[PDB]
Amino acid sequence: THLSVDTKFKTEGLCIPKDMTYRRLISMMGFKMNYQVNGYPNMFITREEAIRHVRAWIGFAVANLPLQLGFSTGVNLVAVPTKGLPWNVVRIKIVQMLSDTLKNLSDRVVFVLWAHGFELTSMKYFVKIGPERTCCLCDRRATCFSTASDTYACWHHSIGFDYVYNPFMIDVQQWGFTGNLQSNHDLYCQVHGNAHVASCDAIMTRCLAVHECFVKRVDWTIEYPIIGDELKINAACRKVQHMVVKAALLADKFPVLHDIGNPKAIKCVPQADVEWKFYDAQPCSDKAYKIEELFYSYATHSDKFTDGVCLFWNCNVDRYPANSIVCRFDTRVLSNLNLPGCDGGSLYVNKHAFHTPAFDKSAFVNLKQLPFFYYSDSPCEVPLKSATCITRCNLGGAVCRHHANEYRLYLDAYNMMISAGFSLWVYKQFDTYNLWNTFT
Ligand SMILES: Nc1ncnc2c1ncn2[C@@H]1O[C@H](CSCC[C@H](N)C(=O)O)[C@@H](O)[C@H]1O
Ligand SMILES: [Zn+2]
Ligand SMILES: [Zn+2]
Ligand SMILES: [Zn+2]
Ligand SMILES: [Zn+2]
Ligand SMILES: [Zn+2]
């Protein structure tokens, strides 16, 4: 489960032996590893584990000489060992930075590294380590230490603290790359250029870790803790998914529905009375028999899916065809669930980690925004006067207390979802006109 200290460390990347282990590395950074039996058996963590703690990822790079310390936050700090700053002021601003960045993301920090060596040596200057401690002021894990008061604090209660306590890290060069950082990074990303500074290294180093671990495909096995409104959000998206698809079907009576990017083969309108077809790039083994393996791009499938309507519910493709229903996460929304990722994309960590290409308007060229409405054919068990309440009773005169209340709940569900950063799009020929007809 944990990364053994006895695992060999490839030194090839370090400007001083060859046949080295983590134990011998850590000792050389200036740290005593006796805390194996206290929940901190290694400063470095397994890739497996790093992925579980992606919310904690902070890229770190370093350019007696002065030292420039860079981070994925685009912050650079210069330390005069004794432009530059005293080490006491630097190490305070580090803890300040990390706390600010991570207080609402993780219970720890993972330093993501392209190990040139000079940064691993620097760690002893701003990192203390020991047994796993809880915070003095709350029951949160301790991430910081104050030499002044000899107390330990989480990211929330770290104000004025100077040393980072029990940080985790990974050297990416230990994943069998060749060539320098920028060579490997620039393959997958052209949003992060070099300015020949540490922060740019830190940024790229994280950007590339994110690519290797997330861009590839969704790992449905790994799940992430609730840090926000996940449950409210995910519930509301499903309530909408149902309402929207049901309505599109009733309106235009599509013979078939191409549910693209459905790896679980589950109908969101179970009692449909429509040919329901499931597709996905990575169908789940358990249900793979009902799901066609397919990676949609317009270039490859503009001459397919001619019949009926395509459902792309958070299936984020180059360009959607004209006969589409789409829910798409606007990667530009600022959120604790929305982490920056590869090539202007972003890593949306909700229940699972979902890497998304950057939100581009050009994808929706063949579509229009899906306007808000509420539709119900169900029975009718502060009087609401809405043109967008498409029920029997609304055109009738006043609307029943049942539908009236369902509207106010669906509306909150819509507003919850839009606020969460999702956007709704539909075939340009869509209109509620036909849903009014379903009554007369
Ligand atoms: N270009 C593409 N073509 C087909 N499936 C894709 C795709 N890009 C991503 N996917 C798949 O679409 C899914 C997106 S996340 C799950 C979305 C699902 N329809 C739902 O409502 O929960 C993943 O299974 C992913 O592998
Ligand atoms: Zn970051
Ligand atoms: Zn605390
Ligand atoms: Zn990048
Ligand atoms: Zn709607
Ligand atoms: Zn009614």
- Residue 206: other Cβ atoms inside 10 A: 31
Is residue 434 within 8 A of residue 376, CB to CB? The reply is no
Amino acid at residue number 59: G
Instruction: Give, for 277, the enclosing helix (H) or strand (E).
Output: strand 275-280
Q: How far apart are CA 179 and CA 11, in angstroms?
A: 14
346-349 sheet: strands from edge to edge: 338-340, 346-349, 353-356
Longest CA span, the chain? 85
Best of 280, 316, 327, 354 for a ligand 1 pocket test (most atoms within 8 Å of beta carbon): 280
**Tokens 């330990």 -> residue:** 152
Residue 74 C-alpha to ligand 2 middle, in angstroms?
A: 8
Q: How far apart are CA 216 and CA 227, in angstroms?
A: 25
CA of 245: how far to CAs of 97, 270, 399, in Å? 45, 11, 24
Q: Given the CA of residue 262, which atom of ligand 1 is nearest to it?
A: 19
Q: Quick one: tokens of 83?
A: 């432009």
Q: Quick one: tokens of 304?
A: 């397919």
Residue 433 C-alpha to ligand 3 middle, in angstroms?
A: 56
Q: Whose CA is nearest to atom 14 of ligand 1?
A: 315
Cα dihedral sign, 137-141-145-150: positive
Residue 239 C-alpha to ligand 6 middle, in angstroms?
A: 19
- Residues contacting 204, CB < 8 A, separation 6+: 59, 114, 181, 182, 185, 189, 192, 194
Residue of 116, 6, 426 lying closest to 244 (CA atoms)? 426
127-128 sheet: strands from edge to edge: 127-128, 163-165, 144-146, 151-153
Q: Given the CA of residue 294, which atom of ligand 1 is nearest to it?
A: 4
Method for this entry: X-ray
**Tokens 């400007």 -> residue:** 15
Q: How far apart are CA 239 and CA 414, in angstroms?
A: 9
Q: How far apart are CA 152 and CA 35, in angstroms?
A: 17
Instruction: Give, for 152, the enclosing helix (H) or strand (E).
Output: strand 151-153
Q: Whose CA is nearest to atom 8 of ligand 1?
A: 315
Residue 323 C-alpha to ligand 3 middle, in angstroms?
A: 52
Is residue 171 within 8 A of residue 47, CB to CB? The reply is no
Q: Whose CA is nearest to atom 10 of ligand 1?
A: 261
- Residues contacting 283, CB < 8 A, separation 6+: 263, 265, 291, 292, 293
Q: How far apart are CA 144 and CA 216, in angstroms?
A: 34
Q: Given the CA of residue 241, which atom of ligand 1 is nearest to it?
A: 21
Residue of 328, 308, 215 lying closest to 259 (CA atoms)? 308
How many residues in total does the chain contain? 440
Q: Given the CA of residue 327, which atom of ligand 1 is nearest to it?
A: 21
Is residue 132 within 8 A of residue 111, CB to CB? The reply is no
Q: Whose CA is nearest to atom 12 of ligand 1?
A: 261
Q: Given the CA of residue 354, which atom of ligand 1 is nearest to it?
A: 15
Q: Quick one: tokens of 420?
A: 């969460």
Torsion of CA 358, 364, 370, 371, to 10 degrees: 90
Is residue 324 within 8 A of residue 304, CB to CB? The reply is no
Ligand 1 binding residues, C-beta < 6 A: 217-218, 260-263, 280-282, 294-296, 313-315, 317, 354
Structure resolution, Å: 2.5
Residue 229 C-alpha to ligand 5 middle, in angstroms?
A: 20
Q: How far apart are CA 205 and CA 131, in angstroms?
A: 29
- Residues contacting 198, CB < 8 A, separation 6+: 61, 62, 63, 68, 69, 70, 71, 76
Q: Whose CA is nearest to atom 13 of ligand 1?
A: 261
Ligand nearest to the CA of 342: 4
- Residue 124: other Cβ atoms inside 10 A: 13
